[PDB]
């Protein structure tokens, strides 16, 4: 699971899209999404 403030990823990101428990994948930009 992607860590806090890590890039969970947006469109085109096939890596760890699911953030760790306690963090939410928030889409900031189309391709850039971060675990807040």
Curated annotation (Swiss-Prot):
Domain CBM1 span(s) in chain numbering: 1-36
Modification after translation: N-glycosylated. The catalytic core domain comprises three N-linked glycans which each consist of a single N-acetylglucosamine residue.
Glycosylation sites: 1, 3, 14
Domain of life the protein comes from: Eukaryota
Cysteine-cysteine disulfides: 8-25, 19-35
Subcellular location: Secreted
Remaining remarks: T.reesei produces two different exocellobiohydrolases. They are unique in that they can hydrolyze crystalline cellulose in the absence of endoglucanases.
Family (UniProt): Belongs to the glycosyl hydrolase 7 (cellulase C) family.
Protein purpose: Exocellobiohydrolases (CBH) that catalyzes the hydrolysis of 1,4-beta-D-glucosidic bonds in cellulose to release the disaccharide cellobiose. The degradation of cellulose involves an interplay between different cellulolytic enzymes. Hydrolysis starts with endoglucanases (EGs), which cut internal beta-1,4-glucosidic bonds in cellulose to reduce the polymerization degree of the substrate and create new chain ends for exocellobiohydrolases (CBHs). The CBHs release the disaccharide cellobiose from the non-reducing end of the cellulose polymer chain.
Domain comment as written in the entry: The enzyme consists of two functional domains, a catalytic core joined to a carbohydrate-binding domain (CBM) by a serine-, threonine-, and proline-rich, highly glycosylated linker sequence.
Annotated protein name in UniProt: Exoglucanase 1
Organism of derivation: Hypocrea jecorina (Trichoderma reesei)
Portion of the parent chain present: 478 to 513 of 513
């Amino acid at each position: 699971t992607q860590c806090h403030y890590g890039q969970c990823g947006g469109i085109g990101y096939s890596g760890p899209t699911v953030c760790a428990s306690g963090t939410t994948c928030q889409v900031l930009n189309p391709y850039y999404s971060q675990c807040l």
